[PDB]
Amino acid sequence: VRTRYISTELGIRQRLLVAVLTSQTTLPTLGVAVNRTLGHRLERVVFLTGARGRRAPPGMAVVTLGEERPIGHLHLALRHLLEQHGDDFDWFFLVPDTTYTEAHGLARLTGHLSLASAAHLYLGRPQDFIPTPGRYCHGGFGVLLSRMLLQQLRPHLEGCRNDIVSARPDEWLGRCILDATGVGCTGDHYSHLELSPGEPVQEGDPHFRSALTAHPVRDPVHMYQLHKAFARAELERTYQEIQELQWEIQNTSHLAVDGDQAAAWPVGIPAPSRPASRFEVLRWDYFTEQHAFSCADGSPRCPLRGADRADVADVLGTALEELNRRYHPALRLQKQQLVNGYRRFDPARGMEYTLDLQLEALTPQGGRRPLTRRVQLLRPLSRVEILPVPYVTEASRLTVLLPLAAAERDLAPGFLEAFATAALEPGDAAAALTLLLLYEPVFAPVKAHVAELERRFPGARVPWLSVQTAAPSPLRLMDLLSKKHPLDTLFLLAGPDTVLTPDFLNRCRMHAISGWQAFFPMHFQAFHPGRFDRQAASEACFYNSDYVAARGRLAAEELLESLDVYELFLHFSSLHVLRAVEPALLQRY
Amino acid sequence: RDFLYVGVMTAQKYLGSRALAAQRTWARFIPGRVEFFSSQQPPPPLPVIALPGVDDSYPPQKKSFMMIKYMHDHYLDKYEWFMRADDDVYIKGDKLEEFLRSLNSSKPLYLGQTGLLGLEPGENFCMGGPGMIFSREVLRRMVPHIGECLREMYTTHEDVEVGRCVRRFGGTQCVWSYEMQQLFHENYEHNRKGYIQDLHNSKIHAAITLHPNKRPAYQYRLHNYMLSRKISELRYRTIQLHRESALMSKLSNTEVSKEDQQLGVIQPRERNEVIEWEFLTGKLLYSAAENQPPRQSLSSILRTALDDTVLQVMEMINENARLIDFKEIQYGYRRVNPMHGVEYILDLLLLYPVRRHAYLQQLFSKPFFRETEELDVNSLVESINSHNEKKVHILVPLIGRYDIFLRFMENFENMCLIPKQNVKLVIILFSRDSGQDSSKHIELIKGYQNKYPKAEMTLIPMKGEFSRGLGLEMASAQFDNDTLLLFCDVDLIFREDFLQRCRDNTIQGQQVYYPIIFSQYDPYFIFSKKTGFWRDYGYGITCIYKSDLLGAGGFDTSILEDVDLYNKVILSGLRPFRSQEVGVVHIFHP
Ligand SMILES: O=c1ccn([C@@H]2O[C@H](COP(=O)(O)OP(=O)(O)O)[C@@H](O)[C@H]2O)c(=O)[nH]1
Ligand SMILES: *[C@@H]1O[C@H](CO)[C@@H](O)[C@H](O)[C@H]1NC(C)=O
Ligand SMILES: *[C@@H]1O[C@H](CO)[C@@H](O)[C@H](O)[C@H]1NC(C)=O
Ligand SMILES: *[C@@H]1O[C@H](CO)[C@@H](O)[C@H](O)[C@H]1NC(C)=O
Ligand SMILES: [Mn+2]
Ligand SMILES: [Mn+2]
């Protein structure tokens, strides 16, 4: 018999389960703080509370126990941990809400014991009893029980509950463990951190480097600060590990096939891509501190705007900080000027820089001397993350619109033919066209074409309305169309010069998320009776509800008259405004 | 560090070839002690154990038995797991440590890939290639009968015999699970050569032990790749820690630090601020930037990056296992934020034949830093308390054009000679019809020569028809291979900024400067749409070292020549530095 997974064959259980003990009052604040500081770094977290006062917080495995007395609460928590879960985990961590958990340190600890050796373990901070020389673990510092210990403890829970008269619950647990199995609290190492009352969290303290619990925590803010400090400590540890790995790669590089490729700065990051042909070379984008000379507009130079300027300033600051750190304390650098600035994006490596800085050197005595240095910065590409996105179905009811003006009657048949070949000819009635007539203060061919389409495709139906009002302002017409339409239809605002294709229809259907995103493509402009125009909105793919919300935000007349629908969604909307190129949309004039 | 003890078997001919590599490759990451075993000899590069009565004879039969006997007799109670492995195997210490820690060492476990002689069907043996791991109990129950197993030898395969010994004494067979074929990879169905070549396979990433690795250099390459993967994982961990710190400071009603907000990122309003996306089909790319051409073919760099991204997506999608398979990309989108990361929208065609979107994101980790030329800090401070750069040789091929010549040299003298810039000017003049403008050019050159007697101005009387390549080649041939040569043009005007950029951007043996010359439109340094445009297709101007030019093979002198030199430079391994050049503008000419 053969299995698809090792877990079934070898009986592999999950590593660790954390059982946070809380109460009715301490759940919505301290339990939530514990969840936000621990649950996203672990696998399974179970919250045990005596009673459920309010509704269970979302994403919180809250379990109602029944009693608030600490001894009975612990007894019922152990009963639940044995009945449910139970023989599914190798280690159980019982920790009160008032104790921060390091998560990473706890996982490292649990991975640092073997099943064969620590079969029956009672882990925690030892504490003296109050004749037996055994010691029990302090409740506030977390207790890491073993599965076998819990199984042997099961038939003694009620016996321990009904005989001894201890006050503290952790002392009761220690007494029960001692009287049932005989093993006390083992100190190993369990790196515990104790906090004096009313203490300020001092980041960078040595005790933050090696500690898996912190007791006592009385407010969620204190827990949050402790978690931030421990995150800083773990970050420093990770930086040290990265340095060690880089050193090992540098040591073993020159014996490998890659050689210089393996030992290419920075050590560990993928080597720069080697172009195969002339066209595949990567061009450095020159920029000064004021203007960028590689403009997507087309101009030879253009002042740095937004993202580019912010990136340049950040890179200059990083370079100055790194130089000051490297030359400290012998030399401190001064006001920095960017003589030459280069930047290219290497898809397999990351964004690269090559700066030529005109720095100034200040000796501690006070000497002044200008200095010119060249530095290189690389932003490595990290792992790929799949962003969550609302589910969108391929088959969506789409309503393509057309504000057919007076002068576009000649070109209207081309749009009608394109729409027919794109949606009406396929059997599925996935699209419907509701064109508008701008009867400015005589369109028989358009109605005849619509009737011909209706007769040729009996299922297809195309309506039309006669806007007598002038002022064809995109917003105005869009409000009228939105008013005379349902609030959940998918809107495809297509200009007269749009040649629809089934591929573009599918892309609009599956990239216009209701209430999450609006799709604004850019067509393929061509010269002479090509280019991707970036200043033309024209085609728009959004939803009626989103447009109504944007119009309400606008309301809360000059903007209504001189605002584009794309500009409206840009300003008065918090929706993704994806502006991508469409090769399937060809335009010409 | 008493968890895992792996004893790797070697041979006298493999001590300095595979044993040393394995000691410097994965013995430094095994959570425990790694000991090398060889045959008895009548200064080895490695500390090795010579098992008595053992000879280097393939297959390594009874050598594994002796090494297991040594394992039990020396470190039975000092370790929980014992691994028998060949020298041509790669073992990942951390993954194996977690996988073994998820197991009970006190139960008899005989791990390894299933092997499918004298096998009555129903039993099996762990294959000796990927690596077979025993437990303490298996050792304790088997090793008293190793001699008995050796005296009942049936087959000529060592791993079959070891599995038979385990089954006869140890109460265990090899693991039957199909997951072993992935964890302990054999890498023999493909890659027949015998050394890992394709490193970007999901099988390589998901495996624990990789075999075979006969070539030591490829073993080092695989080790470097694995360490690079570990570094990338650690960088992602740093990004996650920064995100957590930023969120945690937000919760505590405290201002986030600068290092935690840029890396802790989870409407643009203005029209020219939204970053446009690019269409990515299976083998074509469409862009909206003026610099990029629409419908450009998908570059090999872009193809490799997309393949790696799709591989990562498949790895992080099949983590919930059914087995998802990737076929092709119907279309895609890409938006490169310079300071944050890269956003993808891939419409994959996955197989469980169902399409699935993926709004990917590839953030940037903490930027790295390096100074190109480190300086002596100690020697600098004493100097502070208390033009002589690299000479640029200007080569100017010529034919006629008296007025442009005079304008060029007026600019050259005004910008170099009076400032005494460290340059050498070489005038390559083609004496068309053997005279005519040559005499006046010589007179002007001589007058400018004695006007500035410290200047370096030389004219070479070329003959024959017009040829940029031939004149440039013979002008260069008189200079040594450590000289900086500039392939300047007569109808050009430049300042010292261009000279400094040429000096810095040209690395002897590594980099070639290939500026994008600004060509003035038909009616100065003011850059405007009407004034001129960037000549992307112009590779005429070059700042290249003589040795680099010789290595590129020089000009063909048969025909466009600049494009051929660019291609030869690319093929030679040099790095072409293509970028804008704001220090020199090409004056218009009919
Ligand atoms: O004459 C020999 C050949 C090989 N070996 C060792 O025996 C093991 C089996 O060799 P290898 O892994 O190359 O065989 P493969 O697994 O490729 O069949 C390795 O540790 C070799 O170093 C040996 O001791 N003597
Ligand atoms: C608890 O944590 C989980 C994941 O760690 C999260 O999804 C959930 O929103 C959290 N609940 C609260 C109330 O913070
Ligand atoms: C490991 O196995 C031994 C014997 O099979 C057993 O006594 C021991 O309890 C097991 N360890 C655990 C953690 O169950
Ligand atoms: C000059 O250096 C180049 C570098 O590749 C070499 O090819 C060439 O032979 C050298 N010439 C002399 C004369 O040393
Ligand atoms: Mn082998
Ligand atoms: Mn010219």
Residue numbers in the entry:
A (entry chain A): 104 to 233, 237 to 294, 299 to 551, 562 to 649, 667 to 693, 699 to 731
B (entry chain B): 170 to 211, 218 to 291, 300 to 449, 456 to 510, 515 to 545, 556 to 589, 616 to 752, 765 to 800, ...
Sentences from the study reporting this entry:
Chondroitin sulfates (CS) are linear, negatively charged, and complex polysaccharide chains ubiquitously expressed on the cell surface and within the extracellular matrix of almost all higher eukaryotes. The polysaccharide backbone consists of repeating disaccharide units of N-acetyl-D-galactosamine (GalNAc) and D-glucuronic acid (GlcA), and carries sulfate groups at various positions. Here, we identify four heterodimeric complexes responsible for chondroitin sulfate chain polymerization in humans: CHSY1-CHPF, CHSY1-CHPF2, CHSY3-CHPF, and CHSY3-CHPF2. The architecture of the catalytic sites suggests that CHSY1 and CHSY3 are enzymatically active, while CHPF and CHPF2 primarily play a stabilizing role.
The CHSY3-CHPF complex was selected for structural and functional studies due to its highest thermal stability and in vitro chain polymerization activity in our setup. An octasaccharide, (GalNAc-GlcA), representing both an acceptor substrate for the GalNAc-T reaction and the product of the GlcA-T reaction, was added to the sample, along with the donor substrate analog/reaction product UDP, prior to EM grid preparation. Cryo-EM analysis provided a 3D reconstruction at an estimated nominal resolution of 3.0 Å, revealing the overall architecture of the CS polymerase complex with its four GT domains. Predicted C-terminal α-helices of both proteins were not visible in the cryo-EM map, probably due to a high conformational flexibility. The analysis revealed that CHSY3 and CHPF form a tightly packed complex, with their respective N-terminal and C-terminal GT domains interacting strongly, resulting in a total interaction surface of 6711 Å2, as determined using PDBePISA36. Additionally, EM densities corresponding to three N-glycans were identified at asparagine residues N279 and N710 in CHSY3, and N138 in CHPF, with a fourth potential site at N361 in CHPF. Furthermore, EM density was observed for a UDP molecule and an Mn2+ ion in the active site of the N-terminal GT domain of CHSY3, as well as for an Mn2+ ion in the C-terminal GT domain of CHSY3. No EM density was observed for the octasaccharide substrate that was added during sample preparation. The active site architecture highlights key residues involved in catalyzing CS chain elongation. These include a DxD motif (D261 and D263), commonly found in GT-A fold enzymes, which, together with H394, coordinates the Mn2+ ion. Additional residues contributing to donor substrate binding in CHSY3 are D231 and K238, located near the uracil moiety; D262, which interacts with the ribose group; and R187, Y233, and K397, which stabilize the pyrophosphate group.
